[PDB]
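Q: For a teaching handout, I want to show students what a protein-ligand complex looks like in token form. Below are the inputs, and the small molecule is LBV. Please produce the holo structure.
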Amino acid sequence: DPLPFFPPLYLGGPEITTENCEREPIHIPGSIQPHGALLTADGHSGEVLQMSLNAATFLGQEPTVLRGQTLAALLPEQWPALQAALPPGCPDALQYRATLDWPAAGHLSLTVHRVGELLILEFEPTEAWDSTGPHALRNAMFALESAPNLRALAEVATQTVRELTGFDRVMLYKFAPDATGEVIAEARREGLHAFLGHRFPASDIPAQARALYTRHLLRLTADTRAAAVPLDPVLNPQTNAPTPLGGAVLRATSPMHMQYLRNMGVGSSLSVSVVVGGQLWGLIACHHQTPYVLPPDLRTTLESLGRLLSLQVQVKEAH
Amino acid sequence: DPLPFFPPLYLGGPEITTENCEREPIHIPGSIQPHGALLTADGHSGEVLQMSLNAATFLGQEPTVLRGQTLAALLPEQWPALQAALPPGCPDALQYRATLDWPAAGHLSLTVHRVGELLILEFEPTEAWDSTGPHALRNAMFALESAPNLRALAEVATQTVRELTGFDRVMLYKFAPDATGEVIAEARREGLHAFLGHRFPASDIPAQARALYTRHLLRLTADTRAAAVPLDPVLNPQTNAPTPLGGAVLRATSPMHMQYLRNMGVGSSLSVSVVVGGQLWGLIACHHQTPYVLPPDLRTTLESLGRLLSLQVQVKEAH
Ligand SMILES: *C/C=C1/C(=C/c2[nH]c(/C=C3[NH+]=C(/C=C4\NC(=O)C(C=C)=C4C)C(C)=C\3CCC(=O)O)c(CCC(=O)O)c2C)NC(=O)[C@H]1C
Ligand SMILES: *C/C=C1/C(=C/c2[nH]c(/C=C3[NH+]=C(/C=C4\NC(=O)C(C=C)=C4C)C(C)=C\3CCC(=O)O)c(CCC(=O)O)c2C)NC(=O)[C@H]1C
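A: Here is the structure, written as tokens, with LBV included.
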């Protein structure tokens, strides 16, 4: 049961310290990570309402020009499909995805979700050969199914995610009822110090983060030294209030957690929730030594693997 | 516990009737469906040993020319990857998949699996826009997870598979302990007669088919009037014995079952096993009124959906 959040910094909220960090409003940082661009749009008319300041880098046109234009004009070939896929009242985790062409190498991957009356559109560069078929997940299911017990399932899950992603470290981090955690399996690059069997205080993943991670099952920091890029305007004009970004992987990471990652020598981090009977059971927690953008198709594969693993854990815990 | 099979027709076995059909060797028909091509190759040297008679249609070169050539020569860009993906002793259900270019429209999809010392290579045409992302499955998982009980899960599963495939009819067919079956959910085109709630004798899916369907989880008939195309030579030269084709979706369907489908007015059929605690629990059973080749990526998506559904059933039955 998390504490209520304080206002974010851009609304005069307090600075976050180790004394108050359970109240950081991590879902509304009003900014994104710089490896992609974000727009928000009215859910009915498709009018573009907010834009990340870096949008020209990815979209080819300046934020000041794009604002107020409709998606019906900007994305004539996707707007109907997008509307149909995300009707009013749909779950905020439901996503529409499409691949767009862009004057640069590879393509742009577009991911969209709906929060209330707002559509949130994420654009990130993707290379052609950076596709992952349904086979990745399909082939992986076999070894997960043959695991004879919970610990063996955990060991195969971390090895499989490391093989699929190439991350330097992949852990299964299990929560105890007091919200402390333990690394119960780990696949890692030879020579990296082991976190296997190590336990960590509840404060390392505070209660509002655990709540968020029960609703939105994947999040990441692509570069633990990269500065966030503001949304402009920072408030959603529909509401004159902050834009919820929990459902966007481009959401800026809490600075407190960015410092934690840097202190561990981590250049890139990603985790996927394992949710069992509606409760946060654990995380598939991944590190890389250097910045790294896991491709959208692979992130989606990892999400599905998380759901599979949650069901396999739920089956085994009943036994 | 199925009866032992008789020899196949091409080894002088008996004709199959309603009196002996539990002994039809359905896994070794020595032939494939005509919408793709099949080769078999030695698992170590990659020498091509058998070829479907129609291979020139898909590969551009005549069967008589391709035989005896090595995959190292024929597929220089895939042979190393293929070898690495399917090492000796790997599960016969494990697959390697790749998309090849071919002088015709779209591409060729290549699917490979290993049985003993043999590699079995299936080639089928696929269109560019016939790709299905990991998102299809990922988005589908939500409604399956929210289903409040087993029957509701069944209803959402059939509707979801019908939405993903466009099939005229999608059923969940559940086996009873006496191997009879019941259609426990059904999504169908308006106006088609309902099979919902109908029960069927065990003989409609005989014991050797149920055994096969416990190991190889997807099979189909793309055109219920299409004649099978022989493999040549029909016997695997490694063994001087029939080539097991259970793991190839291009395997020719039992003529008995083809007639059953025609009697039902079905033009195309596909099913996916639901396997719970290693036992065949049921099938996701699909019909179309006319011939139809579900694309490889969508078939793989359906496989994964079957595994997901099996785990969700297993979770709910425990409760
Ligand atoms: C006073 C505030 C604190 C704090 C805040 C915080 N932590 C997170 C998110 C995560 N913390 C994680 C912790 C671990 N990663 C590890 O590798 C290990 C052990 C080896 C642990 C215990 C993880 C996995 C996350 C999830 C994010 C990710 O996978 O990178 C947040 C939320 C970040 C966000 O989503 O914006 C916050 C606010 N952590 C602290 O220790 C104290 C100082
Ligand atoms: C004497 C032999 C018989 C026989 C053989 C047979 N049947 C199958 C495979 C299937 N039969 C299925 C039956 C149903 N489909 C339906 O729509 C309904 C009810 C509405 C039923 C009861 C199904 C679903 C299959 C699986 C294949 C598929 O999905 O199309 C085989 C094996 C075919 C193969 O894989 O080569 C065989 C040998 N069926 C008979 O009724 C008797 C005459």
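A: Two things your students might notice: The interface with chain B takes residues 91, 93-95, 97, 132-135, 137-139, 141-142, 145, 297, 300-301, 303-304, 307-308, 311-312, 314-315, 318 of chain A (CB under 8 Å). DSSP finds nine helices and 15 strands in chain A.
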